[PDB]
Amino acid sequence: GTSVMPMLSAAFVDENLPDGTHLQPGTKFIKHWRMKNTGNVKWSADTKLKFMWGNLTLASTEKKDVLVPCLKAGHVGVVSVEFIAPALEGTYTSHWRLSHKGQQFGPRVWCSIIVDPFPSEE
């Protein structure tokens, strides 16, 4: 015989702030990734969004800026991170992945922006 066993799984659906969005230095913004729980386990306090790599700065700390919804199996929700555009112009990215009880699952999701220089005083 056979039986289903716990499976943590996710699928990317959609997002706001398309990659390459231009922002002014110092802009606080919320990145949203719409995701589906394609597993058979409801997400919980043990489900976290783990930081992978990148140079885009968080608005404060990871405990304050990262939200993982307690998505039921088969449901769609939003994973959100609050960032701040650094002072210097350039390309800034930040990669994340869901993690349940320390085990990574689902796709890698990221935020990619361009910090524009300030407009001239005169």
PDB file of C-alpha atoms in Angstrom:
ATOM      1  CA  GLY A   1       0.000   0.000   0.000  1.00  0.00           C
ATOM      2  CA  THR A   2       0.799   3.722   0.056  1.00  0.00           C
ATOM      3  CA  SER A   3      -0.103   6.963   1.920  1.00  0.00           C
ATOM      4  CA  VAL A   4       0.471  10.652   1.288  1.00  0.00           C
ATOM      5  CA  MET A   5       3.147  12.183   3.498  1.00  0.00           C
ATOM      6  CA  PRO A   6       3.836  15.852   4.419  1.00  0.00           C
ATOM      7  CA  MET A   7       4.835  17.927   1.439  1.00  0.00           C
ATOM      8  CA  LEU A   8       5.850  21.575   1.524  1.00  0.00           C
ATOM      9  CA  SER A   9       5.498  23.097  -1.892  1.00  0.00           C
ATOM     10  CA  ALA A  10       4.886  26.551  -3.438  1.00  0.00           C
ATOM     11  CA  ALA A  11       4.281  28.117  -6.863  1.00  0.00           C
ATOM     12  CA  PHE A  12       4.825  31.703  -7.953  1.00  0.00           C
ATOM     13  CA  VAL A  13       1.637  33.336  -9.237  1.00  0.00           C
ATOM     14  CA  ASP A  14       2.302  37.068  -9.624  1.00  0.00           C
ATOM     15  CA  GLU A  15       4.088  40.114  -8.085  1.00  0.00           C
ATOM     16  CA  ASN A  16       4.068  43.933  -7.863  1.00  0.00           C
ATOM     17  CA  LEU A  17       7.212  46.131  -8.633  1.00  0.00           C
ATOM     18  CA  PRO A  18       8.399  44.547 -11.887  1.00  0.00           C
ATOM     19  CA  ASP A  19      12.139  43.879 -12.110  1.00  0.00           C
ATOM     20  CA  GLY A  20      14.012  47.019 -13.132  1.00  0.00           C
ATOM     21  CA  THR A  21      11.532  49.492 -11.618  1.00  0.00           C
ATOM     22  CA  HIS A  22      13.250  52.882 -11.164  1.00  0.00           C
ATOM     23  CA  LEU A  23      12.982  54.477  -7.700  1.00  0.00           C
ATOM     24  CA  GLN A  24      14.289  57.640  -6.058  1.00  0.00           C
ATOM     25  CA  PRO A  25      17.005  57.267  -3.355  1.00  0.00           C
ATOM     26  CA  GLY A  26      15.485  56.736   0.110  1.00  0.00           C
ATOM     27  CA  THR A  27      12.093  55.407  -1.129  1.00  0.00           C
ATOM     28  CA  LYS A  28      10.413  52.956   1.294  1.00  0.00           C
ATOM     29  CA  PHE A  29       8.379  50.359  -0.602  1.00  0.00           C
ATOM     30  CA  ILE A  30       6.668  46.993  -0.091  1.00  0.00           C
ATOM     31  CA  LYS A  31       7.462  44.154  -2.458  1.00  0.00           C
ATOM     32  CA  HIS A  32       4.636  41.576  -2.822  1.00  0.00           C
ATOM     33  CA  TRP A  33       4.835  38.074  -4.278  1.00  0.00           C
ATOM     34  CA  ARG A  34       1.576  36.307  -4.828  1.00  0.00           C
ATOM     35  CA  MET A  35       2.063  32.621  -4.187  1.00  0.00           C
ATOM     36  CA  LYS A  36       0.143  29.370  -4.119  1.00  0.00           C
ATOM     37  CA  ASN A  37       0.481  26.640  -1.476  1.00  0.00           C
ATOM     38  CA  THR A  38       0.866  23.670  -3.838  1.00  0.00           C
ATOM     39  CA  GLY A  39       1.732  21.339  -0.918  1.00  0.00           C
ATOM     40  CA  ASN A  40      -0.530  19.386   1.455  1.00  0.00           C
ATOM     41  CA  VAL A  41       0.661  21.165   4.658  1.00  0.00           C
ATOM     42  CA  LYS A  42      -0.867  24.463   5.859  1.00  0.00           C
ATOM     43  CA  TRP A  43       1.863  27.077   6.382  1.00  0.00           C
ATOM     44  CA  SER A  44       2.478  28.122  10.003  1.00  0.00           C
ATOM     45  CA  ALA A  45       4.789  29.956  12.430  1.00  0.00           C
ATOM     46  CA  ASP A  46       7.437  27.408  11.289  1.00  0.00           C
ATOM     47  CA  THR A  47       7.111  28.743   7.684  1.00  0.00           C
ATOM     48  CA  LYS A  48       9.493  31.584   7.031  1.00  0.00           C
ATOM     49  CA  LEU A  49      10.885  33.555   4.059  1.00  0.00           C
ATOM     50  CA  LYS A  50      14.658  33.060   4.131  1.00  0.00           C
ATOM     51  CA  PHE A  51      17.034  35.679   2.691  1.00  0.00           C
ATOM     52  CA  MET A  52      19.321  34.172   0.019  1.00  0.00           C
ATOM     53  CA  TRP A  53      21.537  36.985  -1.413  1.00  0.00           C
ATOM     54  CA  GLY A  54      21.479  40.514  -2.841  1.00  0.00           C
ATOM     55  CA  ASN A  55      22.441  44.103  -2.086  1.00  0.00           C
ATOM     56  CA  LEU A  56      18.923  45.681  -1.697  1.00  0.00           C
ATOM     57  CA  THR A  57      18.452  46.924   1.875  1.00  0.00           C
ATOM     58  CA  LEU A  58      15.518  46.063   4.175  1.00  0.00           C
ATOM     59  CA  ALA A  59      13.594  48.992   5.703  1.00  0.00           C
ATOM     60  CA  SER A  60      14.503  47.723   9.292  1.00  0.00           C
ATOM     61  CA  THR A  61      15.016  44.067  10.660  1.00  0.00           C
ATOM     62  CA  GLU A  62      13.860  40.672   9.127  1.00  0.00           C
ATOM     63  CA  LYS A  63      11.443  40.040  12.069  1.00  0.00           C
ATOM     64  CA  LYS A  64       9.657  43.427  11.377  1.00  0.00           C
ATOM     65  CA  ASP A  65       9.819  43.504   7.472  1.00  0.00           C
ATOM     66  CA  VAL A  66       8.992  39.831   6.372  1.00  0.00           C
ATOM     67  CA  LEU A  67       5.414  38.394   6.375  1.00  0.00           C
ATOM     68  CA  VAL A  68       4.506  34.745   5.440  1.00  0.00           C
ATOM     69  CA  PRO A  69       0.693  34.049   5.429  1.00  0.00           C
ATOM     70  CA  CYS A  70      -0.567  30.816   7.038  1.00  0.00           C
ATOM     71  CA  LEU A  71      -1.801  29.542   3.636  1.00  0.00           C
ATOM     72  CA  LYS A  72      -4.010  26.479   3.619  1.00  0.00           C
ATOM     73  CA  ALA A  73      -3.122  23.784   1.057  1.00  0.00           C
ATOM     74  CA  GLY A  74      -4.316  24.864  -2.420  1.00  0.00           C
ATOM     75  CA  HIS A  75      -4.819  28.527  -1.416  1.00  0.00           C
ATOM     76  CA  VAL A  76      -3.197  31.686  -2.858  1.00  0.00           C
ATOM     77  CA  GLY A  77      -1.777  34.477  -0.674  1.00  0.00           C
ATOM     78  CA  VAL A  78       0.828  37.230  -0.527  1.00  0.00           C
ATOM     79  CA  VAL A  79       4.403  37.148   0.854  1.00  0.00           C
ATOM     80  CA  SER A  80       5.569  40.732   1.525  1.00  0.00           C
ATOM     81  CA  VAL A  81       8.962  42.408   2.307  1.00  0.00           C
ATOM     82  CA  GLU A  82       9.401  46.089   3.176  1.00  0.00           C
ATOM     83  CA  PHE A  83      12.580  47.615   1.624  1.00  0.00           C
ATOM     84  CA  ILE A  84      14.296  51.012   1.421  1.00  0.00           C
ATOM     85  CA  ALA A  85      16.053  52.237  -1.756  1.00  0.00           C
ATOM     86  CA  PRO A  86      19.749  52.968  -0.844  1.00  0.00           C
ATOM     87  CA  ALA A  87      21.132  56.547  -1.214  1.00  0.00           C
ATOM     88  CA  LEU A  88      23.484  55.679  -4.090  1.00  0.00           C
ATOM     89  CA  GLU A  89      22.235  55.186  -7.636  1.00  0.00           C
ATOM     90  CA  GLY A  90      22.570  51.711  -9.214  1.00  0.00           C
ATOM     91  CA  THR A  91      21.086  48.200  -9.447  1.00  0.00           C
ATOM     92  CA  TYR A  92      19.817  46.541  -6.244  1.00  0.00           C
ATOM     93  CA  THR A  93      18.422  43.012  -5.863  1.00  0.00           C
ATOM     94  CA  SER A  94      17.229  40.815  -2.949  1.00  0.00           C
ATOM     95  CA  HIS A  95      16.548  37.022  -3.296  1.00  0.00           C
ATOM     96  CA  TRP A  96      14.348  34.987  -0.969  1.00  0.00           C
ATOM     97  CA  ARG A  97      13.004  31.445  -0.599  1.00  0.00           C
ATOM     98  CA  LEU A  98      10.353  29.910   1.669  1.00  0.00           C
ATOM     99  CA  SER A  99      11.549  27.611   4.466  1.00  0.00           C
ATOM    100  CA  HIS A 100       9.493  25.302   6.701  1.00  0.00           C
ATOM    101  CA  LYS A 101      11.162  24.006   9.890  1.00  0.00           C
ATOM    102  CA  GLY A 102      14.562  24.940   8.336  1.00  0.00           C
ATOM    103  CA  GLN A 103      13.950  23.144   4.981  1.00  0.00           C
ATOM    104  CA  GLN A 104      13.759  25.363   1.897  1.00  0.00           C
ATOM    105  CA  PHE A 105      10.928  24.802  -0.593  1.00  0.00           C
ATOM    106  CA  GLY A 106       9.242  26.487  -3.554  1.00  0.00           C
ATOM    107  CA  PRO A 107      10.819  28.835  -6.115  1.00  0.00           C
ATOM    108  CA  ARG A 108      13.308  31.610  -5.498  1.00  0.00           C
ATOM    109  CA  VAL A 109      11.608  35.034  -5.492  1.00  0.00           C
ATOM    110  CA  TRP A 110      13.328  38.395  -5.745  1.00  0.00           C
ATOM    111  CA  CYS A 111      13.037  42.129  -5.912  1.00  0.00           C
ATOM    112  CA  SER A 112      15.116  44.021  -8.487  1.00  0.00           C
ATOM    113  CA  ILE A 113      15.126  47.834  -8.654  1.00  0.00           C
ATOM    114  CA  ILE A 114      17.163  50.668 -10.137  1.00  0.00           C
ATOM    115  CA  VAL A 115      17.956  53.638  -7.870  1.00  0.00           C
ATOM    116  CA  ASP A 116      17.888  56.785 -10.032  1.00  0.00           C
ATOM    117  CA  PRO A 117      20.120  59.750  -9.104  1.00  0.00           C
ATOM    118  CA  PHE A 118      18.410  62.745  -7.466  1.00  0.00           C
ATOM    119  CA  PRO A 119      17.172  65.501  -9.850  1.00  0.00           C
ATOM    120  CA  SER A 120      19.529  68.545 -10.029  1.00  0.00           C
ATOM    121  CA  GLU A 121      18.987  71.387  -7.470  1.00  0.00           C
ATOM    122  CA  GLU A 122      19.564  73.868 -10.339  1.00  0.00           C
TER     123      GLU A 122
END
